[PDB]
């Protein structure tokens, strides 16, 4: 993939908030939303394949990332605000509807789009990230306590702290993160006790079989623009997000929906998706074997075939 071979698009959704996207293809509009800590570029294997399949692909830099605005305020990254901004995004593009496909934090964003703005969502697909309805009798902080695999999320809370570590050496950050599940070097269990996220793992990590040095260097140049404050702010709105998700009053998602799970993602575990058809009647499923968290890079061919088949029928 080569950025300078792409169309680059810009939409101002709020006086000083500008979302950047890459665009390829003609046909119905498909909006791709990456997660943490990623980029439009994370969709590099899907963009040409979806375009070739007869779709108009808009791959976003999410708020806080790449060439999009990265305001420093925490409240700018609560889910309600990010969702309304995606609505304004469609209005300025003149799109009445789009298909939304997301991954990770982007997966969370697309479910809420479908929950609260189903008239603007043609169909919705998520990689890894399940839709779990708000629990009115359990805060998000009490969910993190029960499951110690979400310990890193507490380390992400204090502004500045996680930034300094992820920003210290960008190349190292991305080489340590972007790895197949069997190549993992990360201690996710004890992050607060250790003091750092990488503080037990190599100083000069090897290149994962998933990525080339060129691809890693692309992420390095992108994160030099605004760093990690914007992206990490996505984790600092738990109570606000909880209170907003309660306003749905147990309504259902009635549009065509796809949940694709990945066998080896140890944070967004497949079983976490098990009760979804209760809240989502018209839900179809995909499942990818031998696939870790970084689905699009890990199993691009499988992702492509699943998304294109679902798109052509639903």
**Which is nearer to a copy of itself, 108 or 123 (by Cβ)?**
123
CA 65 to chain CA mean position, Å:
11
Tell me how far, at minimum, the Cβ of 288 lies from ligand S82, in Å: 16
- Among positions 96, 135, 200, 221, the unique one binding a copy of itself when judged by CB under 8 A: 96
**Which is nearer to a copy of itself, 49 or 280 (by Cβ)?**
49
Active-site annotation holder among 61, 104, 151, 298: 104
The token pair that represents 29 in the structure block = 């509009």
**Which is nearer to ligand S82, 2 or 146 (by Cβ)?**
146
Adjacent-strand bridge partners of 100: 31, 124
The helix or strand, by DSSP H or E, that contains position 123, with its residue range, turns out to be strand 121-127
10 contributes a contact to a copy of itself by CB under 8 A: yes
Q: What are phi and psi of 60, to 5 degrees?
A: -80, 150
By a kind-dependent CB cut-off of 5 to 8 A, residue 129 interacts, out of a copy of itself, ligand S82, none, with: ligand S82
Is 151 annotated as catalytic? Answer: no
Exposed e or buried b for every residue in 247-276, given b needs 16+ CB within 10 A?
eeeeeebebbbbbbbbebbebbbbebbeeb
What 3-state class would DSSP assign to 202?
Answer: coil
Tell me how far, at minimum, the Cβ of 80 lies from a copy of itself, in Å: 22
Report the DSSP pairing between strands 7-14 and 56-60. unpaired
Which residues in 55-84 contact a copy of itself (CB under 8 A)?
Answer: 56-57
Residues within the interface to ligand S82 (CB under 6 A): 36, 104-105, 108, 129-130, 132, 152, 177, 267-268, 293
Task: For CA atoms 217, 197, 229, 70, give the dihedral sign.
Answer: positive
11 contributes a contact to a copy of itself by CB under 8 A: yes
Interacting residues with a copy of itself (CB under 8 A): 4-12, 23-26, 28-29, 48, 51, 56-57, 92-96
Catalytic (active-site) positions: 104, 235, 293
């Amino acid at each position: 993939c080569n950025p300078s071979d792409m169309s680059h698009g810009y939409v101002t959704v709020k006086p000083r908030v500008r979302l950047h996207f890459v665009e390829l293809g003609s046909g119905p509009a498909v909006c791709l939303c990456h997660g943490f800590p990623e980029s439009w570029y994370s969709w590099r294997y899907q963009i040409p394949a979806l375009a070739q399949a007869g779709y108009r692909v808009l791959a976003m830099d999410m708020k806080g990332y790449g060439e999009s605005s990265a305001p420093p305020e925490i409240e700018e990254y609560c889910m309600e605000v990010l969702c309304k901004e995606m609505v304004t995004f469609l209005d300025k593009l003149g799109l009445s509807q789009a298909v939304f496909i997301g991954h990770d934090w982007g997966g969370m964003l697309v479910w809420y789009m479908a929950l609260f703005y189903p008239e603007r969502v043609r169909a919705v697909a998520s990689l890894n990230t399940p839709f779990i309805p708000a629990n009115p009798n359990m805060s998000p902080l009490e969910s993190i306590k029960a499951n110690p695999v979400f310990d890193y999320q507490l380390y992400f809370q204090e502004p500045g702290v996680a930034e300094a570590e992820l920003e210290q050496n960008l190349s190292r950050t991305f080489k340590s993160l972007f790895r197949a599940s069997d190549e993992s070097v990360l201690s996710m269990h004890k992050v607060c006790e250790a003091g750092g996220l990488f503080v037990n793992s190599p100083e000069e990590p090897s290149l994962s079989r998933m990525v080339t040095e060129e691809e890693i260097q692309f992420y390095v140049q992108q994160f030099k623009k605004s760093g990690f404050r914007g992206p990490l702010n996505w984790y600092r709105n738990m109570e606000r997000n909880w209170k907003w998700a309660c306003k749905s009053l147990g309504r259902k998602i009635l549009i065509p929906a796809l949940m694709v799970t990945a066998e080896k993602d140890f944070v967004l575990v497949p079983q976490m998706s098990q009760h979804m058809e209760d809240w989502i009647p018209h839900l179809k499923r995909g499942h990818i074997e031998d696939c870790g968290h970084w689905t699009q890079m890990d199993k691009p061919t499988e992702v492509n075939q699943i998304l294109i088949k679902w798109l052509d029928s639903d």
